[PDB]
Structure formats: C-alpha cells, structure tokens
Design a protein around this ligand. Structure first.
Ligand SMILES: *C(=O)CCCCCCCCCCCCC
Lengths: 40, 204
C-alpha cells in the first residue's frame, strides 16, 4: 500500500467498507481552541 | 500584521480559479484568501512531514515567532480557458533572496513540493516580494475536482481531515526560517464564503 495514494484517500470516505488508509485522531477530539472549529 | 515574524510579513495569500469568458472578460473565484491564539504544535506534528527538515526539526531550530497555523474554510462553489493560481505578497525591512517551499501532505506524508525563488523590489522604505499568479500544481487541481465530485459536504471535510499544506519561506543564503505556515482545511458552509483563522504555534 501507499499512504499518499489519492484514490485510496477518496475511496476511504466514498466506500468505507473498503477503506484502506491510516487510522487517525479526528481534529475535533484534539486539544485545540474553539476558534479552530468555529469560523469567524 | 498577523502572519509576521521579525524579518518577514505575509500581507496577502490567495488561491483562485480564473476563467476567460471572452478576450475582454475574466471571472475570478477565490478558494481561500488572507488580506493571535496559541496552538500547541505537538497536537499537529503527526499531520506534517517529520525527520530532518520536517516540522518539529524546523520549529526546534526557530525562531519560534516565525511559526503559524492557518485554518481555512475553503469556498468550492464554482464552475480550455481556465487558470488555477496562487498569489502571495510579502514585505521585509531586509533586501534578501527568499525561497518559498510549499509541500502538500496526505496523512502527514509529503506528496508534492513546489519551490519558488523570489527577489526584492524596493517599496516605500521596505522591500516587497511578490509571487504573482503561480500555477497551481496538477495534483491540487485534481484534488479540488475530486472533492467537488463527492456527493456530500461531510465527505469533503472527512477527506480534508488528512490533507495539509506546509509553507516554509527561507532566506536562501542563510537558510533562516522567515515564515513557516501550516495550513489545515475545511469546506466553507457559510453565506460569507471563504473564511480563515490564524494561530501562533507554540512549544507547549
Ligand atoms: C502544487 O504545486 C502545490 C501548490 C499548493 C499551493 C497552495 C494553494 C492552496 C490551495 C487551496 C485550495 C483549496 C483546496 C481544498
């Protein structure tokens, strides 16, 4: 596999059953300011 | 002067699509545009290239006042005669030769790097540097096309979770970090269109 594979990246969201990408911590679950998620 | 270190200030930054309707008519759409709370940099290291010359390495070498995180809400609401461009403008008290390196990352891994060299123009007591109508790389054009062809806006944000851009502006001769900007993206859902927030990156 390749982490930089563009097709895989988009396939992971379009067809979650066949997702083959690194698993990560969503930004909303991280220690970040409120302003990061609320637009001005 | 938000995106500014002691040596360099980015006054303007924008990515755009320009369409030529006829020889005298041009339509331009802005995806993002710029024209300070602290974020713990450790919270975003995994999203950018690491090892020597990577984000952690760059930040540790400093200066710490050159390091920024920009969160964009991109405006993707737009339609042979097209040009995808990036424009940016900088000012400095110093007459330097600067290099601008832009790295596009997926899952923190570099996919492509674009490198530009810029020379100074004297302007009202200071020196101005402009990257004018720099061509957006094919990867970025295709990425935008694939985003817009996703059925749902939540799918767009899901993809963009693992998509980042790192911009490092350097003094070519001294290798000093003049500005380092980490970019994170979401899709704009607002009537206002493109929006942004700018943070300082701090060690803890
Ligand atoms: C290719 O040469 C890399 C150059 C990338 C320049 C950064 C422009 C930012 C693109 C913003 C468009 C929004 C995409 C969601």
């Amino acid at each position: 596999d390749s982490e930089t594979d563009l097709e895989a990246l988009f396939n992971a969201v379009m067809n979650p059953k066949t997702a083959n990408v690194p698993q990560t911590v969503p930004m909303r679950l991280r220690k970040l300011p409120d302003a990061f998620f609320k637009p001005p | 002067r938000s995106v500014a270190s002691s040596k360099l200030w980015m006054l303007e930054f924008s990515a755009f699509l320009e369409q030529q309707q006829d020889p005298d008519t041009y339509n331009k759409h802005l995806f993002v545009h710029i024209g300070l709370e602290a974020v713990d940099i450790r919270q975003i290291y995994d999203k950018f290239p690491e090892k020597k010359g990577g984000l952690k390495d760059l930040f540790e070498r400093g200066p710490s006042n050159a390091f920024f995180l920009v969160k964009f809400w991109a405006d993707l609401n737009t339609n042979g005669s097209s040009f995808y461009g990036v424009s940016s403008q900088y000012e400095s008290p110093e007459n330097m030769i600067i290099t601008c390196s832009t790295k596009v990352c997926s899952f923190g891994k570099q996919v492509v790097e674009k490198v530009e060299t810029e020379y100074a123009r004297y302007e009202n007591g200071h020196y101005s540097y402009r990257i004018h109508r720099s061509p957006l790389c094919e990867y970025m054009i295709n990425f935008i096309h694939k985003l817009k062809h996703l059925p749902e806006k939540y799918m767009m944000n899901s993809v963009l979770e693992n998509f980042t851009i790192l911009q490092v502006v350097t003094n070519r001769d001294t290798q000093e970090t003049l500005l380092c900007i980490a970019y994170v993206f979401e899709v704009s859902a607002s009537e206002h269109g493109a929006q942004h927030h700018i943070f300082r990156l701090v060690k803890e």
